[PDB]
Swiss-Prot record, chain A:
EC numbers: 2.7.7.-, 3.6.4.12
Organism the protein comes from: Escherichia phage T7
Family: Belongs to the Teseptimavirus DNA helicase/primase family.
Binding positions for Mg(2+) 2 per the UniProt entry: D174
Annotated residues for binding of Mg(2+) 1: E94, D144
UniProt-annotated binding residues for ATP: S249, G250, S251, G252, M253, V254, M255, S256
InterPro entries associated with the record: DNA_helicase_DnaB-like_C, Helic-prim_T7_N, Helic_Prim_T7, P-loop_NTPase, Phage_T7_Gp4_N, TOPRIM_DnaG/twinkle, TOPRIM_dom, Twinkle-like
Cofactor(s) demanded: Mg(2+)
Catalysed reaction equations from the record: ATP + H2O = ADP + phosphate + H(+)
Protein known as: DNA helicase/primase
Domain notes: The N-terminus zinc finger domain is essential for delivering the primed DNA template to the DNA polymerase. The central core domain contains the primase activity. The C-terminus region is responsible for the helicase activity and binds 1 Mg(2+)-dTTP.
Alphabetical keyword list: ATP-binding, DNA replication, DNA-binding, Helicase, Hydrolase, Magnesium, Metal-binding, Multifunctional enzyme, Nucleotide-binding, Nucleotidyltransferase, Primosome, Transferase, Viral DNA replication, Zinc, Zinc-finger
UniProt domain SF4 helicase: residue ranges: 218-482
């Protein structure tokens, strides 16, 4: 048979005050929290009785943090339940001790019961008791102030009656941590008149104070300044984390340099760790292009110099110089979901703060599906999500569809958001859109223009400056230019 | 013994961090050293069926913030 219910007296029982918890002797006496001592050691016994008054089960404690459960602890056990049959309001706490707490602060005059298997069995214990709890006008869930404790509330209210549930919100882990020198009056302000909810994504403003404060200090107005054209900066105020910067333009390798340049100065001048997914080219390749770019020499593009620095030790020197601050890291290739995952671990694992994804036009792997029109968008979002969800700066390169209207891309032709590729996602989900135009057959075949095509954070947009290609060093140098 | 067996699984539904060990005894170990206050489960067919047992449990494991693989 099952563990016999512990007889008071049989086990050397006393209704003594829990001095360790600020629960009075008179309190323990009313809820049925008694102190036995069997076979030598002194146990704390909680008496669970049904609405009828009879003791149906016991939850017994010993010092070290053990248990022993007597009787038959049914799936609907509520400690304190037998005390209240009806009322205007009943607080419902996670554990026995916390029940004893509210029972104090109130001089045991109003109703408090505690969950029978509390913690995890919030959903079951509760729906088991729909009728019992409906006996009261409002049900105040005063659970733990932690991960699983908010969850408990949620699962609880789901199964609990109608518009009666209101969540308790204390300054500390539980209602007793409060009592144990702190804020009795904080517990009180909740018992009377607590807030309403089983919302897993709705979030009252008041309840954001702290998250806000810590935001304001953490994240940064003038986030990361574009390099090579104050202008880009003037108008966009930089690349703030969680944003999604989108560089676009015509045939632009100009474009792939611009991004590269940024990668460069963010990972060296600034402290930031750059992560690069240069899907077009190899990981070796892009590394070279950085090194050369950092040394203002067209490295890959020259047989002689390659040889030269391999031998004269300059390679191992430059390489250390640029790279040896574990600041750059690259996705090296040969899906969408599969990519996104890698990108994430750059963010989450190696914790870079910029990820540059060169060239969105490349979707790749999961083939049985129609328009890149549509899919471009699907990815677009996962990205913006990744972005905002994790506060990483995500620069995303992207290539342009080709007019059908008169002047081409190398004929300079300016670009608008309509001019935009995709079918809306980028035209939307991206926070700043920087475009670069280059009329490669003209007056300044090396002159390149920079439109800010959009910028949430400021909305100051438009022509934002010029740069010039140094065919010689390989850089997008800043340039003097206007009307 | 279904393809998704995790020994200790029933103990934890959510958390900030769950260690996942190769065998049952090792689970018992982490469960000690921590005074059984945090989550540890062990692989159901452990050793070789690491891939299957795990992917069978994507949802369950996603319930936690970080998954600490403490294998052989």
């Amino acid at each position: 048979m099952t563990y016999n219910v512990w007889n008071f007296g049989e086990s050397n029982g006393r209704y003594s005050a829990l001095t360790a918890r600020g629960i009075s002797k008179e309190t323990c006496q009313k809820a049925g929290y008694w102190i036995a001592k069997v076979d030598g050691v002194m146990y704390q016994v909680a008496d669970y009785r049904d609405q009828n008054g009879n003791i149906v089960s016991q939850k017994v404690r010993d010092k070290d943090k053990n248990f022993k459960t007597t009787g038959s602890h049914k799936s609907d056990a509520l400690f304190g339940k037998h005390l209240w049959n009806g009322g205007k309001k009943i607080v419902v706490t996670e554990g026995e001790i916390d029940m004893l707490t509210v029972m104090e602060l109130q001089d045991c005059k109003y109703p408090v019961v505690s969950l029978g298997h509390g913690a995890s069995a919030a959903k079951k214990t509760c729906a088991a008791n729909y009728e019992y709890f409906d006996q009261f006008e409002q049900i105040i869930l005063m659970f733990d102030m932690d991960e699983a404790g908010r969850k408990a509330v949620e699962e609880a209210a789901q199964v609990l009656p109608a518009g009666k549930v209101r969540v308790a919100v204390l300054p500390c882990k539980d209602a007793n941590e409060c009592h144990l020198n702190g804020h009795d009056r904080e517990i009180m302000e909740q018992v009377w008149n607590a807030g309403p909810w089983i919302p897993d994504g709705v979030v009252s403003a008041l309840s954001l104070r702290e998250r806000i404060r810590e935001h304001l200090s953490s994240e940064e107005s003038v986030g990361l300044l574009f390099s090579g054209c104050t202008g880009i900066n003037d108008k966009t105020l930089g690349a703030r984390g969680g944003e999604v910067i989108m560089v676009t333009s015509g045939s632009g390798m100009v474009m792939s340099t611009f991004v590269r340049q940024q990668a460069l100065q963010w990972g060296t001048a600034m402290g930031k760790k750059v992560g690069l997914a240069m899907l077009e080219e190899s990981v070796e390749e892009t590394a070279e292009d950085l090194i050369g770019l950092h040394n203002r020499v067209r490295l890959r593009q020259s047989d002689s110099l390659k040889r030269e620095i391999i031998e004269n030790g300059k390679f191992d020197q430059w390489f250390d110089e640029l790279f040896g601050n574990d600041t750059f890291h690259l996705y090296d290739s040969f899906e969408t979901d599969r990519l996104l995952a890698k990108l994430a671990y750059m963010r989450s694992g190696l914790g870079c703060d910029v990820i540059i994804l060169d060239h969105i036009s490349i979707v790749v792997s999961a083939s049985g599906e129609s328009d890149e029109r549509k899919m471009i968008d699907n990815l677009m979002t996962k990205l913006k999500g990744f972005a905002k969800s994790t506060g990483v700066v995500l620069v995303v390169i992207c290539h342009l569809k080709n007019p059908d209207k008169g002047k081409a891309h190398e004929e300079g032709r300016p670009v608008s958001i309509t001019d935009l590729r995709g079918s809306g996602a980028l035209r939307q989900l991206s926070d700043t859109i920087i475009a670069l135009e280059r009329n490669q057959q003209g007056d300044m075949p090396n002159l390149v223009l920079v439109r800010i095509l959009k910028c949430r954070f400021t909305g100051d947009t438009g022509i934002a400056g010029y740069m010039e290609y140094n065919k010689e060093t390989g850089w997008l140098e800043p340039s003097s230019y206007s009307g």
